[PDB]
Design a protein around this ligand. Structure first.
Ligand SMILES: *[C@@H]1O[C@H](CO)[C@@H](O[C@@H]2O[C@H](CO)[C@@H](O)[C@H](O)[C@H]2NC(C)=O)[C@H](O)[C@H]1NC(C)=O
Ligand SMILES: *[C@@H]1O[C@H](CO)[C@@H](O[C@@H]2O[C@H](CO)[C@@H](O)[C@H](O)[C@H]2NC(C)=O)[C@H](O)[C@H]1NC(C)=O
Ligand SMILES: *[C@@H]1O[C@H](CO)[C@@H](O[C@@H]2O[C@H](CO)[C@@H](O)[C@H](O)[C@H]2NC(C)=O)[C@H](O)[C@H]1NC(C)=O
Ligand SMILES: *[C@@H]1O[C@H](CO)[C@@H](O[C@@H]2O[C@H](CO)[C@@H](O)[C@H](O)[C@H]2NC(C)=O)[C@H](O)[C@H]1NC(C)=O
Ligand SMILES: *[C@@H]1O[C@H](CO)[C@@H](O[C@@H]2O[C@H](CO)[C@@H](O)[C@H](O)[C@H]2NC(C)=O)[C@H](O)[C@H]1NC(C)=O
Ligand SMILES: *[C@@H]1O[C@H](CO)[C@@H](O[C@@H]2O[C@H](CO)[C@@H](O)[C@H](O)[C@H]2NC(C)=O)[C@H](O)[C@H]1NC(C)=O
Ligand SMILES: *[C@@H]1O[C@H](CO)[C@@H](O[C@@H]2O[C@H](CO)[C@@H](O)[C@H](O)[C@H]2NC(C)=O)[C@H](O)[C@H]1NC(C)=O
Ligand SMILES: *[C@@H]1O[C@H](CO)[C@@H](O[C@@H]2O[C@H](CO)[C@@H](O)[C@H](O)[C@H]2NC(C)=O)[C@H](O)[C@H]1NC(C)=O
Ligand SMILES: *[C@@H]1O[C@H](CO)[C@@H](O[C@@H]2O[C@H](CO)[C@@H](O)[C@H](O)[C@H]2NC(C)=O)[C@H](O)[C@H]1NC(C)=O
Ligand SMILES: *[C@@H]1O[C@H](CO)[C@@H](O[C@@H]2O[C@H](CO)[C@@H](O)[C@H](O)[C@H]2NC(C)=O)[C@H](O)[C@H]1NC(C)=O
Ligand SMILES: *[C@@H]1O[C@H](CO)[C@@H](O)[C@H](O)[C@H]1NC(C)=O
Ligand SMILES: *[C@@H]1O[C@H](CO)[C@@H](O)[C@H](O)[C@H]1NC(C)=O
Ligand SMILES: NCCc1c[nH]c2ccc(O)cc12
Ligand SMILES: NCCc1c[nH]c2ccc(O)cc12
Ligand SMILES: NCCc1c[nH]c2ccc(O)cc12
Ligand SMILES: NCCc1c[nH]c2ccc(O)cc12
Ligand SMILES: NCCc1c[nH]c2ccc(O)cc12
Lengths: 335, 335, 335, 335, 335
């Protein structure tokens, strides 16, 4: 038989507990890429990101060299992973890797270029930016890293040209939640201390959100919670039922932030700009409640003057709303 | 003894780390099917699907051949799985496979047709369609795939005739949530790059929802949240308590979308058509609030004219509702 | 030494990868029972059931036979499980078995009757009936099944007499949520196809719910949400504040179904009969809102006639409530 | 070298698959205790308890005997656990043990007293009592049990004197949620059937709750939801806005039980006595709504008589509240 | 070949089940540090903390000594972890360690200084302080501990100088939720009993919260839920709609504590001081409801006296609010 004659010749004395090389000064350079498949979920409140990545490796292993002659011209061959060496690479930003299944097999070639594929899901922790919530651009980081070995032992480089990883839209699942512009690779040499230096190669993946689901469901409710009191201002502020017309909005609007405030994270770089806007709309409707109650103490045992000291309060409204159409377009002109 | 004499003769030198064949140019074709048992849950918000599938395999292994003579006419035999080869197939759309228990045993035959059964549950990620929410048809995808090996090494085909998989309603658990029409198999040859080609065989499973639980509980509440203001229009719009009759609906209806908007996913192909309808019913009741407040500024220190400029607003209502009975029947005429 | 002399004599050549028998035509019949300990949780919405079962097995293994002579009259002996054979039985309705800990040891006897105990928890999927929610009887199914082996290889039977399993209330944890009447065993011969036949033995476990927690907390609130408007009918329907008395109930009652509708599953055999009753109480209070608003358009610039066309609406109420005391007693006469 | 000369002499022929003894009639008595560290969580609704326990064992293993002479006076020694025997003990009330990490090592002595430590967390299921909710005493049960072996094989006893386990407050984490009085050990001999008998040793751990967080946050809101209508009774019941003053409490108080009713379990031994009290306060405020509406039908085209038939309704209030100060003190006199 | 000649010479007889030393009286001192990377989440209600720590070890193993001569001057070498000894250290405050992936490899040197790196995530249980909620300082504890071995077997010490661990801000992820001042190491000698003594070395990590997300979203709503009734006091308390103006705040403010009370833990050292303040603001607004209802029974078939007995109630308000600006600044002067 031809094929298992090779494995008997090859793995007869392959001690798997050795980083395999003939000359130990040379670092066995592993070499990878990523092909990002899908973005599963971005829970902003938990400060984590789950990502499904197809993944590839090769590295030069000299102990696994044969000749295609004397084995009937076999140049590719399958080997169980735990019967050979594997590099100790993993990611500096994981939370739980127990969701990736173990691919049992690898390829090898007659030069010793052992080739490994596996998928890997990472609930990964990168500090997401929540500045402009319905139009956010995300700059997330995957730093694939030798956890133990140093620059003398292994070094990291890329499989292909870095421009090819950049616009790789070969496989992706759109019509989900997100959509990415590009995947940015960049080497970095890491050294936390003296006399130590660790091979790292980052991946600045960047994604942006499709806003159209929030367009009808989130800020279009923010439209007629802002137009309800403008036309709700038009009746003369001496009906008496103005305060029952108005305070039912006010604590009713407290649940609109506190649902969103428990949705959105505790990052102190800022409350989102969509979030700061309906708190400030609540910061200017409440002073109108003073104005509809000072008039009824005034009209008590200057009626035209209450109409015009409160008419200047109406100018406060469309000062804010006409300040708000520009902050959407100057976010619409970001993507 | 007869039976373990066979296993001693058979697995004496079976090196499990070799894709087993006599001639390595021939690809060892695995051959499967599915018998879909139940659909556990469809959480629309997480963009995932959990599915319980009974599952089958065989492939031709020449190293496990014997003769039924000299072993007392034994033609079937049980073998532990991790003592032989297994193909590396798994699914391109998983999230977590740690819910399937390991079936320890397989069959073999005297031709070498090793036969494997196992169940497998997949929390699987397929981009579900949320266009018509209470009557949706789902086109979900299971792509069973050699994760590592190529067309030279293994190829995928089907067990039985593809028409038999199509209407296979042998075992299924109805009276759950869903009900499927058919399971559609289709081969595809996959090749992401040059000089590589990977055996894939999809499964376009398609399911549709029984709407009868939402019939009483979801859109029948949408009936009398739409009939409440029609008869709530009939009193003459000068009672003064019209606005307290009406605004209590309006922000009260904001919680009806925002419960559903946090239930339903952020897919930007569309808000559901059932969901877009009670936002537009909210988009036309709010302009009536202008009409019940412009009349009370008009009636202030043309009364018949307020009755008829607002009567044309009543025509806006049954313009929308009679536009809504057709969009249910033209979804009732989809299934 | 006496005891480990036996294990050296017994497991010297016991190849564990063989279904152990001397004559392979004879099927090695396993033989089990269950002793149901507790019912952990019934989440109706997820269509699953978690159950803690004490569990037992034996089967005749001829290769493990010795004589009590030459071993100082030893008739029972402990063996590690993964050093012998085990049948491949598991349950057709699981969701996740990773909650059962591995019992490492088994018994054997001098006849070869290897005996195995283990506990097993199953989040199990059986189509629960939600017809009569506070008084439901549940007919759930546990089908213990050879996943791989057929009728020629193994067969399933019961340990004890089937009447003893029926009323087995030896160990159970009452004062929890549920309480079972009986556990019903029944053999079935399973054969999905031709030339194949698989040993199955079901367990129709049936449980019923103690209603007393819902008695005060669920349908006693349904009492005075139904008596609140009956006495709330008694004031004459021309107070003007009748609509503010009444519509605050109506959308306030919409949250009473939509909390329960997201609690209770999407099974289309029916909304529960307790659930269909307070939607129909909402279906008849809303037409009273028409009656309290048609009278105020009538009383506008026949007063005794509005009192009696609405008095017949009062007969609609106790037509429904006196139709409701019978549907509880005819559920109280089910258990 | 001295130390690994011992392990080579000791584990040369130690067949781990034998319950180790020289004479098999003698049962190898294991011997344990517990040192309860912390109580993590008590979710009442799931009927489970998570508990972090430090844990200890020893048992007499005669096969591991040596002499301190010829090994340089070594009397203690470390051994990997899976290279020796271990008893099969585990707990009858677990839900999931996959949270305890595997302690790899054990001690031994020159007498053969092998000593084992390990921590173990148990999400454990014991039928908790919910009678008096803010002052509850809990009688929970941990039954450490040989799952397989019988009285002939192993027996269970205690490490130390049972009075020392009783008041063991050496290590505990207070300022959490709970605080225990004592840990009560008690042997029991278990025998579910004939010809079988299983070594069990229970642990009646008992804990009680610190009520001070619920003191301000749970029943102090129950104070001014009961004083709000008493002073809300003082205005004369002919204001007309009494019903809008009152029904807004009533369905508003329905959400106060139904938040708590979905918090608290479905045990039918009783709704909690704190829970039964604000349902009965709701059972007596609703009949006052009849009294404030029968008077306005009376005062319609006996005014002093409506003041005094409703004054006797005021006596119903402080009949209930003065019946309620005693049920707190007679729970304050339980701890 | 040079490198695997070493591993064949080194691990030929290395029995891994021995704590490796030449003289057993000497304790093999392990030696560690921590480099705290990120704080993932602090769920106050579950009384747990999840922490991602980079982690380091070394210990002197004499059995792994070689000379750099005869191996081509190799001074560093990689070894699989489960092929050598490892100390049994783990943490006394874990909940679940199954989130840390297994680093397969370690270093060694020609002196025998075996060096080990691994990451480790701990959902860890330390009694967090909830006294001053938006400005809290946390004193959490990580006690790295030999679970089994004693002072004779292993001892714990630190890698580097303890001042270097103190201000180690080399790698940290800020712009998350938290920010730490320092990491405090301290040895402690632990001995729960007589004749036993266990090596422990604590880590008093201390973190404090950035308050700026709660600044706009949590206590700025607490501003205008306190200013709404102050200006809502200014109208004269005889409008009649004062009670409908006021009670709608009161039970509406009950949901503001009971959302937070189910957010915040059941620790009985105290309700938070931010939490005790809006319960006492609710404790003083409710007595104003008595004052707005005693006046309307007074004004019934002394009007200026109702204005001034209630004006002293206004002094109660800014007695509390001016007592509240100091308790923020005297928390602003804590960090
Ligand atoms: C994401 O953020 C990183 C910063 O960490 C950006 O990296 C910078 O990229 C520019 C462009 O090449 C360089 O000049 C800087 O030196 C980089 N800084 C660092 C610290 O790496 C990165 O560009 C951002 N992603 C995108 C898409 O802009
Ligand atoms: C480790 O790998 C990096 C690249 O992964 C090496 O950087 C290369 O350095 C050479 C010369 O020093 C340049 O010609 C290449 O263009 C560099 N590549 C990149 C991507 O920048 C680095 O030299 C390696 N170090 C060692 C010690 O092997
Ligand atoms: C689910 O969607 C796929 C599209 O991905 C449909 O597949 C098409 O099927 C038709 C009918 O045979 C072919 O003509 C097309 O070439 C297929 N396209 C692709 C991309 O596969 C599939 O039919 C859909 N499912 C159902 C039940 O209609
Ligand atoms: C891999 O398998 C597919 C089917 O699984 C093969 O497609 C078959 O091709 C032959 C001739 O090329 C046809 O007669 C069959 O009808 C095809 N089957 C189907 C289902 O379409 C394919 O040829 C195989 N390729 C290799 C290299 O083995
Ligand atoms: C649970 O449902 C099953 C139906 O699947 C019932 O099984 C039937 O039992 C009767 C009584 O022996 C038989 O006559 C039928 O042939 C059975 N049918 C099937 C399909 O098994 C079972 O009785 C139900 N449980 C209870 C307690 O009534
Ligand atoms: C497989 O087991 C079942 C029972 O588990 C066998 O059914 C028995 O059949 C015999 C005669 O055929 C009857 O006398 C018994 O009363 C049956 N038992 C029961 C519980 O019904 C069945 O025959 C077995 N089949 C094989 C091939 O062994
Ligand atoms: C917890 O409940 C058990 C009952 O299961 C109590 O056990 C009883 O204790 C008394 C006092 O020794 C004995 O006289 C009884 O015989 C015991 N009964 C059983 C069934 O064990 C136990 O005392 C309770 N815990 C506490 C602290 O009182
Ligand atoms: C099994 O262990 C229990 C204790 O764990 C034994 O009970 C002891 O019995 C002896 C005499 O029978 C008494 O002197 C002791 O005081 C008992 N101990 C306790 C704690 O009650 C029991 O006898 C043992 N049984 C066997 C067969 O070994
Ligand atoms: C966290 O709390 C511990 C108390 O457990 C503090 O430890 C004390 O520190 C002081 C300062 O060195 C010592 O004098 C005490 O003896 C320590 N007591 C104990 C019990 O260890 C620790 O200082 C606190 N953390 C911070 C940052 O203050
Ligand atoms: C165990 O280790 C601790 C330190 O980790 C030792 O404490 C040292 O003791 C010596 C003399 O007793 C002092 O010179 C050092 O300064 C101490 N170190 C520290 C950090 O305090 C302790 O002696 C060791 N014990 C044994 C038995 O080895
Ligand atoms: C192997 O390959 C070489 C070159 O491709 C060729 O000359 C030779 O004939 C081949 N031999 C076999 C057995 O295929
Ligand atoms: C085996 O099978 C063959 C053909 O089926 C038959 O001729 C022969 O007698 C059988 N032998 C035994 C021992 O069953
Ligand atoms: N069957 C797809 C195998 C495969 C093809 N190309 C790939 C790229 C990356 C990867 O992880 C895997 C793959
Ligand atoms: N006992 C059922 C075994 C079985 C019968 N037919 C099957 C089909 C598929 C499968 O995974 C399993 C099976
Ligand atoms: N210690 C209880 C062992 C045991 C006794 N009877 C049993 C019955 C079933 C079972 O799984 C286990 C048991
Ligand atoms: N380092 C603490 C080891 C330890 C000391 N005493 C203990 C008691 C029980 C236990 O599980 C463990 C221990
Ligand atoms: N590649 C980073 C390896 C590393 C460098 N310094 C470290 C410190 C601690 C640690 O666990 C790990 C490390």
């Amino acid at each position: 038989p031809a094929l298992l004659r090779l494995s008997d010749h090859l793995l007869a004395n392959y001690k798997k507990g050795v980083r395999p090389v003939r000359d130990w000064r040379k670092p066995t350079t592993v070499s990878i890429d990523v092909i990002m498949y899908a973005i599963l979920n971005v829970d902003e409140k938990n400060q984590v990101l789950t990502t499904y990545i197809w993944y590839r490796q090769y590295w030069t292993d000299e102990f696994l060299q044969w000749t295609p002659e004397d084995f009937d011209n076999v140049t590719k061959l399958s080997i169980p992973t735990d019967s050979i060496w594997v590099p100790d690479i993993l990611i500096n930003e994981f939370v739980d890797v127990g969701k990736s299944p173990n691919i049992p097999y690898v390829y090898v070639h007659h030069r010793g270029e052992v080739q490994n594929y596996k998928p890997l899901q990472l609930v990964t922790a990168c500090s997401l930016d929540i500045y402009n919530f319905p139009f956010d651009v995300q700059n997330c980081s995957l730093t694939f890293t030798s956890w133990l070995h140093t620059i003398q032992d292994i070094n990291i480089t890329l499989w292909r040209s870095p421009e090819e990883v950049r616009s790789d839209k070969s496989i992706f699942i759109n019509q989900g939640e997100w959509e990415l512009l590009e995947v940015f690779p960049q080497f970095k040499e890491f050294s936390i201390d003296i006399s130590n230096s660790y091979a790292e190669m980052k991946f600045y993946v960047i994604i942006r959100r499709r806003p159209l689901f929030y367009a009808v469901s989130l800020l279009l409710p923010s439209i007629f919670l802002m137009v309800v009191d403008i036309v709700g201002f038009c009746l003369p502020p001496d009906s008496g039922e103005r305060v029952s017309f108005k305070i039912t909005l006010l604590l009713g609007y407290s649940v609109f932030l506190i649902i969103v405030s428990d949705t959105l994270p505790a990052t102190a770089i800022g409350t989102p700009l969509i979030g700061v806007y309906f708190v400030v709309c609540m910061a200017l409707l409440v002073i109108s409640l003073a104005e509809t109650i000072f008039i009824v103490r005034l009209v008590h045992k200057w009626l035209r003057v209450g109409y015009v000291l409160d008419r200047l309060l109406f100018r406060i409204y469309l000062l804010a709303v006409l300040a708000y159409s520009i902050t959407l377009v100057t976010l619409w002109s970001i993507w």
